[PDB]
Amino acid sequence: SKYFTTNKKGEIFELKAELNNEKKEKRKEAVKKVIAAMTVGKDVSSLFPDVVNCMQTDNLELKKLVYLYLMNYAKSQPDMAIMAVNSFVKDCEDPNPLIRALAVRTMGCIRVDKITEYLCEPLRKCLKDEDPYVRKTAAVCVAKLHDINAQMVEDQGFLDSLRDLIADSNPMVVANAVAALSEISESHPNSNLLDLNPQNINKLLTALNECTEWGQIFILDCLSNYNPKDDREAQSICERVTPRLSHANSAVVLSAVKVLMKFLELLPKDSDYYNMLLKKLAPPLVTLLSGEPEVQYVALRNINLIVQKRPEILKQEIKVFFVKYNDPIYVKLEKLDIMIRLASQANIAQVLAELKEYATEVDVDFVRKAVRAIGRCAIKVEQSAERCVSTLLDLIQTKVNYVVQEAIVVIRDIFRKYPNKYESIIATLCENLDSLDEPDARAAMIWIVGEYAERIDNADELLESFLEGFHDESTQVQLTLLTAIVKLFLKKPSETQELVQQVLSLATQDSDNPDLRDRGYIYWRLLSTDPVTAKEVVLSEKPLISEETDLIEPTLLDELICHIGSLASVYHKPPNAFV
Amino acid sequence: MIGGLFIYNHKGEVLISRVYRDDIGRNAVDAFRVNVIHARQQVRSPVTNIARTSFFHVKRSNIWLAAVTKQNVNAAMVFEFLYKMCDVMAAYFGKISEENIKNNFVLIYELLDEILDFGYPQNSETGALKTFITQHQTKEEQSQITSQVTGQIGWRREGIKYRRNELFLDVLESVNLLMSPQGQVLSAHVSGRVVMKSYLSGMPECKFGMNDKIVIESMEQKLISEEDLGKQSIAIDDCTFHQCVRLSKFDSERSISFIPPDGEFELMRYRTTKDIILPFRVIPLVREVGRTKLEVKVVIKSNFKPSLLAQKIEVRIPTPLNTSGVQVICMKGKAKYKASENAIVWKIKRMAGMKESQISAEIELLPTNDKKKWARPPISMNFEVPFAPSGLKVRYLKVFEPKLNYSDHDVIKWVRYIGRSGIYETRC
Amino acid sequence: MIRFILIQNRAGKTRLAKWYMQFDDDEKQKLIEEVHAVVTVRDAKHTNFVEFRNFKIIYRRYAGLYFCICVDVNDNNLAYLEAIHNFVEVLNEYFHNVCELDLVFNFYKVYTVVDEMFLAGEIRETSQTKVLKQLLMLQSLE
Amino acid sequence: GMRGLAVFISDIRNCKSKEAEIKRINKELANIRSKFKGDKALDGYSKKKYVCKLLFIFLLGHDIDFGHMEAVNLLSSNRYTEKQIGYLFISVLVNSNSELIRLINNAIKNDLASRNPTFMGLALHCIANVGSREMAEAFAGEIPKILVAGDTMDSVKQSAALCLLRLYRTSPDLVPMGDWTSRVVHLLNDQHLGVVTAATSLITTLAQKNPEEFKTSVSLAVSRLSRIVTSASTDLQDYTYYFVPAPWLSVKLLRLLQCYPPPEDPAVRGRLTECLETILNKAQEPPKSKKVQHSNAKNAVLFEAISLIIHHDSEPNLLVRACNQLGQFLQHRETNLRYLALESMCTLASSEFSHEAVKTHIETVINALKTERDVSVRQRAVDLLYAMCDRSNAQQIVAEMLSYLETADYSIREEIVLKVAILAEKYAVDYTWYVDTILNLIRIAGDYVSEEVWYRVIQIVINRDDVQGYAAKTVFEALQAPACHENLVKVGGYILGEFGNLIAGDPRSSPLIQFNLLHSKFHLCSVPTRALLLSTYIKFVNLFPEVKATIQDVLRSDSQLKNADVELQQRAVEYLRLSTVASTDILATVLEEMPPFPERESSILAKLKKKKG
Amino acid sequence: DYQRLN
C-alpha cells in the first residue's frame, strides 16, 4: 500500500521491465506505480494490454485495483472495454456475492449500451438475488444506469422490478432502493415514484425506526415529497418523529424539522403536541449551536430561517447568541444579528452597552453591521433611538468614513421612519459631502436634499457643485438627484428652473436608459404641464414601510422549506439560482 | 450522489483522488486547488461555492479534505460522513498522516467506494469490517458476512467471550461557567458524556439508572449513595444519545434500550444548563487610575470541602500592558508572572476547599484607552479537579448476559466523576 | 525587454533568480510559485513562451532544469529561444557536463557570464567562440 | 582560497533538516558577524569568502545590513574578485545611506577614469541596475562621452549602450540630445555588429522619440540591410549563429524602419522590393539543414519583414505571396507554428486587398478551431475572421460561432458574444432575422449579458421601425417560454409594453393573462428590473384599457406600499396616485411612443477596446 | 480520582 507517487522519464519502460516479470512482486509494485500515475492523473491506458494479460489471475486486491484502473481509464478509452466485459461476466459467475457486487459496481460505474445487455438479465438476477450486497449494488448500478439512456423498455422493466423492490425486507437493499428512487425523482417526467400509500408510509416509518440513519434520511426526504391529506395522519407521523431526537443528528434533525414544518402549519390549539414541540424545540436548537462550528454554523443559518418563518418562544433563548472573544468573527456576527432579531427590551440597555463595546473593538465589518443594527433598534422602540442618536453621533465623531458611510443610509431610513426630529445633524452632514464614496450614503444625502430643500436654503450652491457629477455615476444616483430637484422645484420653484432645464436636457440627451429619458419626459410634461398638480401627488406625504428590517420573501422562504436541511435553504439562495 | 472526495496536504497536491461522479473534471479539481488551497485572502468557509458548485473542503487537521459536489444535498450528512471517515481512519490506525494514508491506500479506497458508492453513502457500522477490512472466503464465511450484513445488529456483536465481565465508567463533567467579574454566575452550565469502557463476553443489552425528575435519591452499591433529595439531579436539559439506544423506547417510557459494544465508547452525552456547584468565590476586577495606571483587584475565595484538594492551582491574572510600577499582593501559593502575555500567574502548588488567596495589582500605564482601548482579558482559574458537580449519579445500572451464563452479579462495574473547570474566566 | 531570468531545478526551488526590474519578495515569490506550477502542468506539446495573465515568459524546460526568462508582448520569441539554447550550450560546454553541485559552488560564474552577454534587460552579446574565449580568459580573474 | 565559504557550501548543502540549516546559518552568523562585529576583517580571502556568502544568503532569503561601506572597501580592495563581488552586491543589494551611494558614484567615476574595460563595464552594469538618478545626473552627457567621443571597441560600448538605454527609458529627462545622428548612423554602417545591435536598439528608442530625426538613416540602413540579407553568413563567423545573417540586428533595423511610413520611394524602396522578393523567395525553400533553430530564425525574421510589409497592403502581388504562405502555414504540426501564423494572419486580416483571399480559408479556420482543443489559436482566428467578416459569411458565422460558444469560458464568452453582436450590427440589414439571432443569443444565456448590449439592441428596435410588430410578436413568443432570463424579461417586457399592441389580434395577446404572468415574475428579480416593469405596467393600461381595473386593484397591494426602498416607494406612488386618482387624460398625455433614439456611435466598441489589452 | 466503584 506504501506510497509510490512516481511516473515519468522512461520509468514507464521500467514499469514495463517489472511488468516483464509476471512474478507477483514486480507486478504489485508496478501496480502501485500505476496507482501513482492514476492519482497524479497521468494516463496508463497503454498498459491495458499488459493490464489485461497479467489480469488473468485470481487475486482479490488485484481484482479491485484492476476494477478501478480499467473503469476509470476505459472512461478515457471505451474501445478496449471488450476485455472488461469478459472478466465482469466471469465474476458474475463467481459465487462470492461480495466480489460479485464489486464487479457489479465497477461495471455499472460505466454505461454505454453494450455492457448493458451483457448484464441485463444478470442484473435482473441481482434483483432476483437474496444477498444484500448483490441486490444493493444492483439498485446502485440501476441508479447509475439512469445516468444516460434511462428511457428504454429494458431499463423500464428493471424500474418495475426495483419499484416492487421498494417493498423489500432487506434493510440494505430497501434502503438504497429508497435512496435511488429519491434521486431518480430528479429525473423529471414529474410523474416519478407512484408507490406512495398509507400502509407504505407506515412500513417505511417502522423501517426508519429500525433502519440506519441513511435509510432514515432517505425516508425523510421522500416524506418531504409525499403530501398528506390532513393532520390526523400527520399527527401520527409527528408521533413517529417523537423518537427522532438525538441520533447521528444534524442531517436527520434538519430533515425532520423540514418534514415537520411541512405539517407544522395548523394551530397549537388544534393539538398541544404542536405547542409541546414548540416549547421542547429550544434546547435541541441550542445543541445544534452547541455542536461543532460548521454544524452550529449551518444551525445558525437554519435558525435565522426559522426566526424568519417562526418568530416565537426562542425569543427567550438569545443567551445562545451571547458573543465571546473566542467566538469566530462571523459566528459572532450572526450571534449579534439574531440578538437584535431577538430584541430583549429588558436587556437593550446592557445590550447597547455591549454594542458600543463592540464598536470599540478592532474590526470594521462587524462594527458597520452593529451600526446598522443599532439604527434598526432606533427604528425599533423610540427610547433606544436617543442613545442611538448620541452613540452614532460620537461615532460620526470617530471620523472613520466607512462607519459613517453606511450610517448615513441607516439614519436616512430612520428619519424616513422618523422625520423632522433631529435635523440638527443635517448641518454636520453638510460638511460631510467631501467624502461621498457610497452610492447608498450619497443617495441618502440627496434624499435629505429632496426632503428639506425647502428648509435647506444653502442647497443652491452645494447642488450646483454636485452638478459636477452627471456622468460616471450609477443611474440611481442620477434619479435620486432628479427627484430631489423635482421636490425642490416644487417647494422652491423660484430658482430651480435653470437647474431643472439643464439637467433635463442633459439626462435626456445623454441618456441611455429609456426609463431615465422618459422619466425626464414625464418630469417636464408634468412640470411644464401642471406643477400646480404635481405637488398634490409628490409634495404630499408618502407613508412609511413599517419596520421591514431585512424581511424575507415568503414564497422563497416557503419554498426553501423544501430545502431546510439541503444546501439551498442553509445557503439562503434559491436552489434554482445554482445549477 | 456525490463525486470527487479528495484529501489534501498543505502543499496542495491530493493525498487522495477519490471520485464518485462523471461530471468531475480535472480542470475542475486543479482549479479548486489553486483557488481555495491557494488564495491571497485567508477568510473562507469549510463549504465553498464556485460557479454554482458546492465545495465542502475541510482541513480536519494539518491534513485537508475536499468534498466536491454540484448536487444539492444535506451538507450536514456530508460532514457527518467526513467525520465518520477520519474518525474510523484514526480508530484503525491512530495518527492520520502521509504514511498513515499510504500504507492504508487499498483499504482506504475499497472502504470509501463501499461506504460511499457514486456518492451514495453506505454505512460504516464496522460490525466486522476491520476483520476482513484488514491492513479468501469460505461457505460459512460467505453466508456469515452476508447474514451479518442482513443482521440488524452492529457495534461488534456476534457473541464474544471475555475471561471476566467488567466495565469501568468515567463521568466527565465539563464546567461551562461564566460569572460576572463583580460576582454573578452569568453562565452556569455543564457538558458531560458517559464514556463506557467495558470488558464483557457475549452481546448483552444493558440498562442503567440515573436519577430523574428529582435531585438524586454487586459488591459496592455506592460510596456516596444517593441520599433522598440528594445531589443536583434535574430533567436533563439536553441528553444526547448514540446508535445503540432506542429512543422509541425512551419517548414511550423515558428509557432507551442500549446493546453496548465492548471496549471503550461514549454511551450518551448530556448537558444541563442549571443547578451547579461553585468551587470558588472570586471577584476579579480591574480599575483605572486616570490614564497612567491600571489596577486589578483579584480576591480569590476558594469554596469546596477543605478535604477536597485541587492541585497545580494556576490562575490567569492578566497584568496591564504598559508596566511602569507594579504593586504585588501575596497570600498563599507561588508568585509567578507572565510576560509576552502580560499576566500575573498566581500559580499555587495545591489548594484545599473553602480557601481564599487574594492578589491585588496595580500596573502603571500610558494613555491608550481611547475609542479603541485596552482589551479586558477574562481572569480564569485553571487547575485539576475530579468532581460530580451536579452529583447526578447512578440511580441504578442494569447489565447482564441473558443468553448463557453470566448474570448481573457476574459483572463488576465502575465509574469515575471527573469535573472539568478550565472555563472559569472573568475579568470583563 | 527581459523582465527577469529565473532558473529552477527539478527539485522545485528556483536555482537562479535573475531580475532586471525592482521586483519584490512577494512579487518574485509569486512569480516563482506560479511559473513553477505552470511548468509542472504544462505538458510536452507546449511552446517555450507562456503568457501569464498579462504577458509572457520565454521559458526553457530541461529534465532537471527550467530556464525561465520573462519578456512581455512583442519580442520575437524564436530569437530569444535560440539565444537561450546558445547560452545552455555555452554553460555545459564550459561547465563540462555540469552537475548542479558545480553551480552550487559556481552559481556566481553563471551569473556574471549572464551579466556579460546579457545586460539591462537585453542581450549584451551573442558570439559563441568569442563568448567562450572571453569567459575562459576572464575565468582567471582574481 | 578561503575555507569558510567552501566548507559552508559543502556542509549546508548536506544539511537537510531545516533546523540543521538554521544551525549552520547561525554558526556562519557568529563567524561573519563577530569577524566584522569585532575580530577585524582581513582583506582577500576572508572578505571574498564572507561577502560571497553574505550575497548568496541575501539571495537565500536574507539580507546584509553592514559591510557595504566595507563593500566599498571591496571595490577598494586588490583582488578583482573583491571589487567584482562589491559590484554585484551593491548591484544585487539595493543601497541606502547616500554617503554609501556617494562613495559608490565616486568609485564609479574612478572606474571610468580607470579606462580599462572591466572597471567601466561593471560600473555601467551597476549604474543600469542600481539606477540611481544621480548616475544620469553626473552622467547625462558623460555616458555619451563614454559611448562616443572615443570609439574603440564593441563589448564595453554596447555595455554603455544598454546602460544609457536603461537610463533613457527610465530617465530621458536627464538626457539632453542636441544632435548625435551621424555617429550612430555610421555605427549602422559599422560591420562590427557587436555595437551595432545595441546601437540600433537605442537608436530605435530615440526614433520612437524622433523618427523624423533620422531620414539619413534610411538610405544607409536599407543598403546595409539589403547587404545583410544578401551577405548571409560566409564571414564574421562568430557574428554568425547557425549560418543566419544577423537575425537580431536585422529585425531591429526592419522594425525600426517600420515606424517610418509605407513604401513611397521608387528606387531606394525599389531596392526594398528587391529585399522583399529575396526574403520570400528564400524562405520558401525546404531546409538543406535539419535543425529547427534555422527554421526558428528564418521564420522570426520572416515575421519581422512581413510585419514591416503589413499595414501597407499597397503591394497586391506581395499580399498574394503572403496569403499563400499563410495558407501553407496553418498546417505545421506544432501548435505554436500555426498559432503564431494565426497572429500574423489576424494582424494582416484587415486587408481590403486580400480580405477575400483570407476568407477563402474560412472552413480551414472552422474545422481547425473545432478540432483544436485550445483557445488562444481560436481567438486569433476569431480576430482574423472578424477583420474580414461580412454579411454573406456572417449568416453561417452566427451558427458556427454559437455552436462553439455554448461550450466555452465565461468572460471571453461575454467579449465574444458582444463582438459578434456588434459585427452583426455592422451587417444588420436583415433586422427581423437579426432580431431572431438576438433571441437565440439570449436563449443561450440571456442572464450574463451586460446592460449597454441589450440597451443597444432596444435602441436599434425603436430605431428600426420595421419589425416592431414582428419583434413584439416574437417577444411574446419568448415570453410564453416557461423559463426565465432577466435580461429577456426586461427587454421584451418593455418592448411589449410599448409594442404589445403591434401583436394584439391574437388570443395569446391578452394583457390580463400576460399581466398576471409578469406579476408572478414581478417580485422575483433585481430592483432596476422592477422599475422597468413599473414603466411597462403603466404603459399597459394606457395602451390596453381592458386590463386597467385589474391593474388598478393590484397596484394597491401592501407590497408596493411597503417596499422598503425610497425609490420604488415613490415610483409606485407616482404611478398609483395617477392610476387610482386619474385625470385619465394625463395618462395618454404623458404616454408617448418613446421615439427612435437620437444618433450615437455604439460606444460598445470602445468599451470592448478598453477591455482589449 | 482513581477509585474503585461497583
Numbering used by the authors:
A (entry chain B): 4 to 582
B (entry chain M): 1 to 135, 142 to 223, 236 to 446
C (entry chain S): 1 to 142
D (entry chain A): 9 to 621
E (entry chain P): 1 to 6
From the paper:
Clathrin-mediated endocytosis (CME) is a vital multistep process in all eukaryotes in which plasma membrane cargo proteins are first concentrated into a patch by clathrin adaptors, which are themselves clustered by interaction with a polymeric clathrin scaffold. The most abundant clathrin adaptor is the 300-kDa heterotetrameric adaptor protein 2 (AP2) complex, consisting of α, β2, μ2, and σ2 subunits. AP2 plays a central role in CME through binding plasma membrane phosphatidylinositol 4,5-bisphosphate [PtdIns(4,5)P2], the two most common cargo motifs (YxxΦ and [ED]xxxL[LI]), clathrin, and other regulatory/accessory proteins [reviewed in (1)]. Here, we used cryo–electron microscopy, tomography, and subtomogram averaging to determine structures, interactions, and arrangements of clathrin and AP2 at the key steps of coat assembly, from AP2 in solution to membrane-assembled clathrin-coated vesicles (CCVs).
We recruited AP2 FLAP (henceforth AP2) onto phospholipid membranes containing PtdIns(4,5)P2 and TGN38 YxxΦ cargo in the same physiological buffer conditions used for single-particle cryo–electron microscopy and imaged them by cryo–electron tomography. AP2 coated, and in some cases tubulated, the preexisting liposomes. Compared to the closed form, Cμ2 has moved to form a planar membrane-binding surface, and its movement with respect to the β2 N terminus has freed up the YxxΦ cargo binding pocket, which has a density consistent with that of a bound cargo peptide. The [ED]xxxL[LI] cargo motif-binding site on σ2 is accessible to membrane-embedded cargo owing to a movement of the N terminus of β2 relative to σ2. Our structure of AP2 on the membrane shows that the open conformation did not result from this or other crystal packing artifacts. We observed three sites at which the AP2 electron density contacts the membrane: the proposed PtdIns(4,5)P2-binding site on the α subunit whose mutation abolishes AP2 membrane binding and two putative PtdIns(4,5)P2-binding sites on Cμ2, the simultaneous mutation of which inhibits membrane binding and reduces CCV nucleation. The first Cμ2 site corresponds to a basic loop including K167, Y168, R169, and R170 following the μ2 linker helix, which undergoes an extended to helical transition between closed and open AP2 (11). This location suggests a direct physical connection between membrane binding and stabilization of the open AP2 conformation and points to interference with this linkage being the explanation for why an R170W mutation impairs CME and causes neurological defects. The second Cμ2 contact appears to be mediated by residues K350, K367, and R368 within a basic patch also containing K330, K334, K352, K354, K356, and K365. We do not observe a membrane contact at the proposed β2 N-terminal PtdIns(4,5)P2-binding site.
